[PDB]
Amino acid sequence: DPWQECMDYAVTLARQAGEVVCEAIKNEMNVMLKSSPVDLVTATDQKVEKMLISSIKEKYPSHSFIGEESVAAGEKSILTDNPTWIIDPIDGTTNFVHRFPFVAVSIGFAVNKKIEFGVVYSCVEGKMYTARKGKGAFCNGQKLQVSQQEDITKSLLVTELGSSRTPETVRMVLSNMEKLFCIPVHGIRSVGTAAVNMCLVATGGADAYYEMGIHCWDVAGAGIIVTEAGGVLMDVTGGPFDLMSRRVIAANNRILAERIAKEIQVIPLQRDDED
Amino acid sequence: DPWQECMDYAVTLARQAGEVVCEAIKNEMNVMLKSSPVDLVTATDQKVEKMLISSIKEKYPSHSFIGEESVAAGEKSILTDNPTWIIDPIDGTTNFVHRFPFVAVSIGFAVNKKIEFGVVYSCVEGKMYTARKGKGAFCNGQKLQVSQQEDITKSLLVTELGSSRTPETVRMVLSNMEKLFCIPVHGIRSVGTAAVNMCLVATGGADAYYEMGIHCWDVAGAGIIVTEAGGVLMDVTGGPFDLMSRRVIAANNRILAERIAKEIQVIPLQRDDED
Ligand SMILES: CC(Oc1ccc(O)cc1)(P(=O)(O)O)P(=O)(O)O
Ligand SMILES: CC(Oc1ccc(O)cc1)(P(=O)(O)O)P(=O)(O)O
Ligand SMILES: [Mn+2]
Ligand SMILES: [Mn+2]
Ligand SMILES: [Mn+2]
Ligand SMILES: [Mn+2]
Ligand SMILES: [Mn+2]
Ligand SMILES: [Mn+2]
Ligand SMILES: [Mn+2]
């Protein structure tokens, strides 16, 4: 693990950022909009992202960045082979402005376009999720393992309704949920952050997560936490996972993942690596 | 206060039960079915309820009970004027079976058919929610207050899909969710327990909860926590909350509650005081 120093620095930065987010979640909210009345942001997201990028630049000036709010400011979401930090300063902005207690700082680190480590700090909970390729996944000193469940009819899934309110899109998201729900599955849960939903699969508390519409910074930190806990990532088609494709299944195993893929009708989405 | 001693004792019992649940969620389980393959129970539910009822009976032998698993064993869900303990030994049985970290012990105490106090212990989180009529609502000794939000388009709701897998029922649950979602609201969350969903409204972290299909023991502990935090309970018709009706809206205020009620199509259900 030659990236141990980098990950340990990422953990300290995530904890620092988490403290900023915790302080801000107790204070007055000035909610701002991005593309729609349900695509939210605050000054805290922007402050935290700028702190993270400037701190990483100081120690690792040759590295590259992909950050949610930097992309909103016009930066590109193109992943080269160069070591790259893929940052979501606050995953769960809707939760944050409501003080719903699942908000995370997410950092994924890629080399040769492959994730080498991931850090997800659920900062109201004070849960530091981490994983390094080949070294396992952890939450606050506890090594993580996905569940063993291979029977979809005894599974607990996690998903979210999405940021679209387009009637045809909402109908397809609800149809997909209906089809899975009526297999049946034991249930479906929604805590409101992609990174925390995925970390819940890594812990074994849920058996699988799926969503269409995520961005690369939503899944770059948590994906490796799922796989180092023994899980799998794939596209909702069953095809290989792609960070820039807007789609993911993060599951305990390929049996549940492929069974979920068989019920998901795909919605058209703009890739993060294209204009 | 003639019921503060009962409340103090209820808190002690809820914490004791919660410690049993906490230990059991880490261990092997015997997962059993009740009315269907998605209506679950474990031996821990049954053990905890028997402990709670035997403990209350020894200290208050003239009091009555309505306990979830005792009703499953043939006891009646009739609420008289006699002091009555309305118990859910484990709210979130599906979550418990999956180790999804939101499970609660719920105790509501009614006199003359009106709730006088409520205790909800979210076991895995270690959060003790309490409220006595006229005395405020608390979480781990800290006073709670519902959110101020009166604009439904800036609200965060909590709800659940339900225990039914009947196609017509599921379609109606999802249609109700679609209508609210597309008002729009900011989002919908699902942590998997009625009592914890309601306590999230009492804290202000969510603006409102609604569900059809709950039972009296799901809402008897948490309802008073919502109202002592400054919120409201209502039927999905917009009318008075009815503890045995299977339906609830628990909101920060009447503006959001009535707006939610306007979108809900009522699902037919057998009342808890019907056979
Ligand atoms: C909506 C955002 O993140 C997600 C993604 C998927 C979810 O289920 C929840 C939150 P958020 O702003 O980070 O809160 P995104 O980064 O995609 O704009
Ligand atoms: C399903 C049960 O309670 C609920 C009720 C409503 C929910 O949204 C979640 C759990 P649970 O067994 O307590 O988990 P019920 O007491 O109704 O059988
Ligand atoms: Mn965003
Ligand atoms: Mn974000
Ligand atoms: Mn995000
Ligand atoms: Mn039950
Ligand atoms: Mn129960
Ligand atoms: Mn219950
Ligand atoms: Mn307003």
Curated annotation (Swiss-Prot), chains A, B:
Its EC number is 3.1.3.25, 3.1.3.94. Pathway: Polyol metabolism; myo-inositol biosynthesis; myo-inositol from D-glucose 6-phosphate: step 2/2. GO terms for molecular function: fructose-1-phosphatase activity; glucose-1-phosphatase activity; glucose-6-phosphatase activity; glycerol-2-phosphatase activity; identical protein binding; inositol monophosphate 1-phosphatase activity; inositol monophosphate 3-phosphatase activity; inositol monophosphate 4-phosphatase activity. Changing E211Q: Strongly reduced affinity for myo-inositol 1-phosphate and strongly reduced enzyme activity with myo-inositol 1-phosphate. Its cofactor is Mg(2+). GO terms for biological process: inositol biosynthetic process; inositol metabolic process; phosphate-containing compound metabolic process; phosphatidylinositol biosynthetic process; phosphatidylinositol phosphate biosynthetic process; signal transduction. SUPFAM superfamilies: Carbohydrate phosphatase. Belongs to the inositol monophosphatase superfamily. This is Inositol monophosphatase 1. Changing K34Q: 50-fold reduction in activity. Keywords: Cytoplasm, Hydrolase, Intellectual disability, Lithium, Magnesium, Metal-binding, Phosphoprotein. It is linked to Intellectual developmental disorder, autosomal recessive 59: A disorder characterized by significantly below average general intellectual functioning associated with impairments in adaptive behavior and manifested during the developmental period. Phosphatase involved in the dephosphorylation of myo-inositol monophosphates to generate myo-inositol. Is also able to dephosphorylate scyllo-inositol-phosphate, myo-inositol 1,4-diphosphate, scyllo-inositol-1,3-diphosphate and scyllo-inositol-1,4-diphosphate. Also dephosphorylates in vitro other sugar-phosphates including D-galactose-1-phosphate, glucose-1-phosphate, glucose-6-phosphate, fructose-1-phosphate, beta-glycerophosphate and 2'-AMP.
